[PDB]
Write an enzyme that holds these catalytic residues in place. Structure first.
Site, PDB file in Angstrom:
ATOM      1  N   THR A  14      48.512  26.246  94.015  1.00  0.00           N
ATOM      2  CA  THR A  14      47.753  25.415  94.183  1.00  0.00           C
ATOM      3  C   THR A  14      47.116  25.122  92.549  1.00  0.00           C
ATOM      4  O   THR A  14      47.008  25.837  91.482  1.00  0.00           O
ATOM      5  CB  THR A  14      46.529  26.296  94.731  1.00  0.00           C
ATOM      6  OG1 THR A  14      47.268  27.066  95.310  1.00  0.00           O
ATOM      7  CG2 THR A  14      45.128  25.198  94.191  1.00  0.00           C
ATOM      8  N   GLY A  15      47.278  23.659  92.303  1.00  0.00           N
ATOM      9  CA  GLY A  15      47.054  23.336  90.758  1.00  0.00           C
ATOM     10  C   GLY A  15      45.793  23.170  90.631  1.00  0.00           C
ATOM     11  O   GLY A  15      44.651  23.026  91.718  1.00  0.00           O
ATOM     12  N   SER A  16      44.839  22.586  89.217  1.00  0.00           N
ATOM     13  CA  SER A  16      43.898  22.882  89.607  1.00  0.00           C
ATOM     14  C   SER A  16      43.148  21.302  90.117  1.00  0.00           C
ATOM     15  O   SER A  16      41.743  21.642  90.330  1.00  0.00           O
ATOM     16  CB  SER A  16      43.119  22.255  87.621  1.00  0.00           C
ATOM     17  OG  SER A  16      43.820  23.363  87.428  1.00  0.00           O
ATOM     18  N   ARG A  19      47.471  20.951  95.493  1.00  0.00           N
ATOM     19  CA  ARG A  19      48.125  22.116  96.228  1.00  0.00           C
ATOM     20  C   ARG A  19      49.866  21.141  94.958  1.00  0.00           C
ATOM     21  O   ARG A  19      49.619  20.210  95.675  1.00  0.00           O
ATOM     22  CB  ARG A  19      48.076  22.489  97.092  1.00  0.00           C
ATOM     23  CG  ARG A  19      47.396  23.648  98.332  1.00  0.00           C
ATOM     24  CD  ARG A  19      47.790  24.235  98.917  1.00  0.00           C
ATOM     25  NE  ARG A  19      47.238  22.529  99.901  1.00  0.00           N
ATOM     26  CZ  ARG A  19      48.090  22.801 101.406  1.00  0.00           C
ATOM     27  NH1 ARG A  19      48.158  24.111 102.265  1.00  0.00           N
ATOM     28  NH2 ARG A  19      48.328  22.203 102.317  1.00  0.00           N
ATOM     29  N   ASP A 132      51.613  16.029  76.543  1.00  0.00           N
ATOM     30  CA  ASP A 132      50.898  17.337  76.267  1.00  0.00           C
ATOM     31  C   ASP A 132      51.656  17.822  76.607  1.00  0.00           C
ATOM     32  O   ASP A 132      52.294  18.771  77.126  1.00  0.00           O
ATOM     33  CB  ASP A 132      49.388  17.576  76.918  1.00  0.00           C
ATOM     34  CG  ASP A 132      48.750  19.352  77.062  1.00  0.00           C
ATOM     35  OD1 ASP A 132      48.513  19.715  76.110  1.00  0.00           O
ATOM     36  OD2 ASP A 132      48.842  19.509  78.376  1.00  0.00           O
TER      37      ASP A 132
END
Length: 265
Positions: A14-16, A19, A132
């Site tokens: 789960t990403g910030s 998902r 980044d």
């Protein structure tokens, strides 16, 4: 074009901002991933700027950049899926964590691969002017290939806390005080240093103490198992003067970098 054209195998993480899922395309069984993004609370404006980026993403085609494959909208749940290349080896943060847990350093050959393939990724990004360079944004496939995959797209309550609580270990001196390609060389230097020493070059318990450290430009030599040549190039990328850092071209001209360090698909 349709969500039914794929089958979710399982959730990878789960990403910030939603998902990430491992999926299989039905037509050929091509293993892939998609990122699940709920645009339900977005404005017509945010969604247009969000389109602009998916399109720019669509436009990167490089062996060392995570390949974009497809868009899918499911308006019923207001979910946008972004289909992407699956990278079997995971991210570099997990590799670096593993090196700490098992108290063992990564082969210099591996560092050379990341250095070579990430530099080539940067040069592509620079040519087309989200890059980044944290470990978590860098992936490995199953063929010793290294791919950059910053998914800043997904970026506000959870984007505020991440910008605010998070520590900028990789912040160049210049960016502390615009676009500057030499700032990406510094970030790369920080990344490769951490791949070698298993810790970032500058560390602190406060952003102000970290700024002071970064401004002095002093760090430990990477472990002695790494060649003086590797230490030199990394040290050069971590120079206080942007103009003393190697360009992408100067990096690739280094005698350390050989054909086999490049991508092989």
């Amino acid at each position: 074009s349709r969500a039914e054209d794929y089958e979710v195998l399982y959730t990878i993480g789960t990403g910030s901002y939603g998902r990430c899922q491992k999926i299989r395309r039905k037509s050929d069984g091509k293993i892939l991933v998609w990122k699940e993004l709920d645009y339900g609370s977005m404005t017509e404006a945010e969604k247009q700027m969000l389109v602009s980026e998916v399109n720019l993403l669509r436009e990167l085609k490089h062996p060392n950049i995570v390949r974009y494959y497809d868009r899918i909208i499911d308006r019923t749940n207001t979910t946008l899926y972004i289909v992407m290349e699956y990278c079997e080896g995971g991210d570099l943060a997990s590799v670096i964590t593993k090196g700490t847990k098992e108290r063992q350093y990564l082969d210099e050959e591996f560092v050379l691969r990341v250095m070579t393939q990430l530099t080539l990724a940067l040069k592509e990004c620079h040519r087309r002017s989200h890059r980044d360079l944290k470990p978590a944004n860098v992936f490995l496939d199953g063929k010793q290939n290294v791919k950059l995959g910053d998914f800043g797209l997904a970026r506000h309550d959870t984007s505020f806390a991440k910008a605010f609580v998070g520590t900028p270990y990789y912040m160049s001196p210049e960016q502390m005080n615009s676009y500057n390609e030499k700032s990406d060389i510094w970030s790369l230097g920080c990344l490769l240093y951490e791949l070698c020493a298993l810790m970032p070059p500058f560390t602190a318990f406060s952003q102000k103490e970290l700024a002071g450290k970064i401004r002095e430009g002093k760090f430990r030599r990477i472990p002695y198992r790494y060649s003086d040549e590797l230490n030199e190039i990394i040290t050069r990328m971590l120079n206080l003067k942007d103009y003393h850092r190697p360009s992408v071209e100067e990096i690739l001209e280094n005698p350390l970098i050989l054909e086999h360090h490049h991508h092989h698909h």
